Write an enzyme that holds these catalytic residues in place. Structure first.
Site, mmCIF file in Angstrom:
data_model
loop_
_atom_site.group_PDB
_atom_site.id
_atom_site.type_symbol
_atom_site.label_atom_id
_atom_site.label_comp_id
_atom_site.label_asym_id
_atom_site.label_seq_id
_atom_site.Cartn_x
_atom_site.Cartn_y
_atom_site.Cartn_z
ATOM 1 N N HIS A 11 -3.181 4.357 -1.618
ATOM 2 C CA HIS A 11 -3.922 4.767 -0.429
ATOM 3 C C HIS A 11 -4.666 6.073 -0.700
ATOM 4 O O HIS A 11 -4.127 7.164 -0.491
ATOM 5 C CB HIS A 11 -2.980 4.964 0.756
ATOM 6 N N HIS B 257 -8.824 7.455 4.189
ATOM 7 C CA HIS B 257 -8.519 7.884 5.549
ATOM 8 C C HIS B 257 -7.894 9.255 5.773
ATOM 9 O O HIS B 257 -7.127 9.444 6.717
ATOM 10 C CB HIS B 257 -7.661 6.802 6.212
ATOM 11 N N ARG C 33 -7.461 1.953 -2.610
ATOM 12 C CA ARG C 33 -8.314 1.941 -1.427
ATOM 13 C C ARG C 33 -8.933 3.322 -1.235
ATOM 14 O O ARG C 33 -8.232 4.334 -1.251
ATOM 15 C CB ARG C 33 -7.537 1.561 -0.159
ATOM 16 N N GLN D 26 0.881 -1.160 0.000
ATOM 17 C CA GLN D 26 0.000 0.000 0.000
ATOM 18 C C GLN D 26 0.917 1.207 0.000
ATOM 19 O O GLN D 26 1.751 1.360 0.894
ATOM 20 C CB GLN D 26 -0.903 0.047 1.232
ATOM 21 N N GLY E 51 -8.517 -6.548 9.426
ATOM 22 C CA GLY E 51 -7.379 -5.846 9.988
ATOM 23 C C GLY E 51 -6.956 -6.406 11.332
ATOM 24 O O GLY E 51 -6.040 -7.223 11.427
ATOM 25 N N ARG E 52 -7.643 -5.974 12.383
ATOM 26 C CA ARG E 52 -7.320 -6.400 13.737
ATOM 27 C C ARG E 52 -7.301 -7.911 13.962
ATOM 28 O O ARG E 52 -6.463 -8.411 14.718
ATOM 29 C CB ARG E 52 -8.254 -5.683 14.711
ATOM 30 N N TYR F 61 -5.617 10.935 3.997
ATOM 31 C CA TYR F 61 -4.234 11.184 3.624
ATOM 32 C C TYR F 61 -4.201 12.035 2.349
ATOM 33 O O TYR F 61 -5.253 12.487 1.904
ATOM 34 C CB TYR F 61 -3.478 9.855 3.546
HETATM 35 C C1 LIG Z 1 -3.271 -0.677 14.056
HETATM 36 C C2 LIG Z 1 -3.958 -0.319 12.725
HETATM 37 C C3 LIG Z 1 -3.281 0.199 11.658
HETATM 38 C C4 LIG Z 1 -3.916 0.537 10.390
HETATM 39 N N1 LIG Z 1 -3.153 0.961 9.333
HETATM 40 C C5 LIG Z 1 -3.723 1.048 8.133
HETATM 41 C C6 LIG Z 1 -2.916 1.292 6.928
HETATM 42 O O1 LIG Z 1 -1.682 1.341 6.939
HETATM 43 N N2 LIG Z 1 -3.614 1.645 5.817
HETATM 44 C C7 LIG Z 1 -5.047 1.635 5.703
HETATM 45 O O2 LIG Z 1 -5.580 1.910 4.502
HETATM 46 N N3 LIG Z 1 -5.792 1.371 6.818
HETATM 47 C C8 LIG Z 1 -5.200 1.036 7.958
HETATM 48 N N4 LIG Z 1 -5.953 0.635 9.043
HETATM 49 C C9 LIG Z 1 -7.356 0.227 8.768
HETATM 50 C C10 LIG Z 1 -7.424 -1.276 8.480
HETATM 51 O O3 LIG Z 1 -6.905 -1.611 7.196
HETATM 52 C C11 LIG Z 1 -8.884 -1.795 8.559
HETATM 53 O O4 LIG Z 1 -9.648 -1.293 7.415
HETATM 54 C C12 LIG Z 1 -9.594 -1.503 9.865
HETATM 55 O O5 LIG Z 1 -8.791 -1.968 10.977
HETATM 56 C C13 LIG Z 1 -10.999 -2.045 10.013
HETATM 57 O O6 LIG Z 1 -10.995 -3.473 9.865
HETATM 58 P P1 LIG Z 1 -11.017 -4.465 11.101
HETATM 59 O O7 LIG Z 1 -12.297 -4.231 11.865
HETATM 60 O O8 LIG Z 1 -11.052 -5.865 10.409
HETATM 61 O O9 LIG Z 1 -9.788 -4.271 11.927
HETATM 62 C C14 LIG Z 1 -5.364 0.392 10.326
HETATM 63 C C15 LIG Z 1 -6.061 -0.004 11.491
HETATM 64 C C16 LIG Z 1 -5.425 -0.458 12.643
HETATM 65 C C17 LIG Z 1 -6.223 -1.098 13.760
#
Ligand SMILES: Cc1cc2nc3c(=O)[nH]c(=O)nc-3n(C[C@H](O)[C@H](O)[C@H](O)COP(=O)(O)O)c2cc1C
Length: 364
Positions: free
Chosen positions: A181, A184, A233, A100, A323-324, A186
């Site tokens: 990206h 969010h 994304r 990404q 993600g998590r 950015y």
């Molecule tokens: C610790 C952490 C770091 C993340 N870093 C990114 C990232 O680098 N780029 C991005 O597009 N979203 C990022 N996200 C969003 C995740 O990709 C994901 O869409 C979000 O956690 C929701 O999904 P989940 O409920 O399965 O965790 C991040 C979220 C968390 C919790």
């Protein structure tokens, strides 16, 4: 056992063996100076190689793109060499990994910018939030974002070239795909949103103007590599990092998606809501998106295996990015397939630190 979550899916130039993807996750564990990926990061990704597709943590396209201490880059020789080892490890385990690529724009701090100068953005408006830096001991700390400098019209071509070069580097680094990206809050999203973009030139105002930059980037990277190697994304509905998708978010979103569709890119990754609350997507909106994009559609945002199966079964999305759950379960595919329990999450170690809370979560 589920139903379709564990069936193959063609994603542009590669084929995923299942639809359980690893969402891009910023972990801020890179080496500084240099924003260099590490052997530890390599092990982390390797442990998760059974994912249908791994989408890496956000990675800088340039030094200027940096907004978080600990986030890796893909612009220098040392960074390229490091990433080559990480992708090789993933491939050694028969996995697939996309990088990404981002530019943080105003979600940054002058102390980590080249020359210690103010970060750039669409307009000179502070994000009024915080970012993560590191203290004298290397520990992650939060700091107020620095007010950005509005990019000059003549500086835009350089931004587009930085994305182009990063994709070229990604290709050499061994990545299977690249994910832009554009979500969010950015840089790309900063231009897309009317709340963060007050420009009066051709990069601000109408949705056509607001989407201009991201579309130029998409064209630039498709030409550099191949459209079937490009993913993007977006988080077009709701509010993220204080950047609000205008009063016509749904209409503006569909416009962007139709334009992206024209380039025949590999996939459209939709971040449905930020970590905080957010209105859920209506099936009507999902249908409208579905009929406008001809590639793979990935859904993300507090998904459950059940929700993924439901939407995939309805033909609204093709894959789901977790993600998590992936942070805490390297073998998430096996666990969801076996309907096994998941390891508990330890949020305190999501950002920064070392092996603990990173390569720490056991597999079945
Ligand atoms: C610790 C952490 C770091 C993340 N870093 C990114 C990232 O680098 N780029 C991005 O597009 N979203 C990022 N996200 C969003 C995740 O990709 C994901 O869409 C979000 O956690 C929701 O999904 P989940 O409920 O399965 O965790 C991040 C979220 C968390 C919790």
């Amino acid at each position: 056992s589920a139903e379709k979550l564990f069936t193959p899916l063609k994603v542009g130039a590669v084929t995923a063996p299942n639809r359980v993807f690893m969402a891009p996750l910023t972990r801020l564990r890179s080496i500084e100076p240099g924003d260099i990926p590490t052997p530890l990061m390599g092990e982390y990704y390797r442990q998760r190689a059974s994912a249908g597709l791994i989408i890496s943590e956000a990675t800088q396209i340039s030094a200027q793109a940096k907004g978080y201490a600990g986030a890796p880059g893909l612009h220098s020789p040392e960074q390229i060499a490091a990433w080559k080892k990480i992708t090789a490890g993933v491939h050694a385990e028969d996995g697939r990994i996309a990088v990404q690529l981002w530019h943080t724009g105003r979600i940054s701090h002058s102390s980590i910018q080249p020359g210690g100068q103010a970060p750039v953005s669409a307009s000179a408006l502070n994000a009024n939030t915080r970012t993560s830096l590191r203290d004298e001991n290397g520990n992650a700390i939060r700091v107020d974002t620095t007010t950005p400098r509005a990019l000059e019209l003549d500086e835009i071509p350089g931004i587009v070239n930085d994305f182009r070069q990063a994709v070229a580097n990604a290709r050499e680094a061994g990545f299977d795909l690249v994910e832009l990206h554009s979500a969010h809050g950015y840089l790309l999203h900063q231009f897309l949103s009317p709340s963060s973009n007050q420009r009066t030139d051709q990069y601000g105002g109408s949705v056509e103007n607001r989407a201009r930059l991201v579309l130029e980037v998409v064209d630039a990277v498709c030409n550099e590599w191949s459209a079937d190697r490009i993913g993007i994304r977006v988080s077009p509905i709701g509010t993220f990092q204080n950047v609000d998708n205008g009063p016509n978010e749904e209409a503006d979103a569909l416009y962007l998606i139709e334009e992206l569709a024209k380039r025949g890119i590999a996939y459209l990754h939709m971040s449905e809501t930020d970590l905080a609350g957010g209105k859920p997507y209506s099936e009507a909106f999902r249908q409208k998106v579905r009929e406008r994009f001809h590639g793979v559609i990935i859904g993300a945002g507090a998904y459950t295996a059940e929700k993924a199966e439901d939407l995939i079964g309805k033909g609204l999305i093709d894959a789901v990015a977790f993600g998590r759950d992936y942070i805490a379960n390297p073998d998430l595919v096996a666990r969801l397939q076996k309907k096994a329990e998941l390891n508990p999450q330890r949020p305190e170690s999501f950002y920064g630190g070392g092996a603990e809370g990173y390569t720490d979560y056991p597999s079945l």
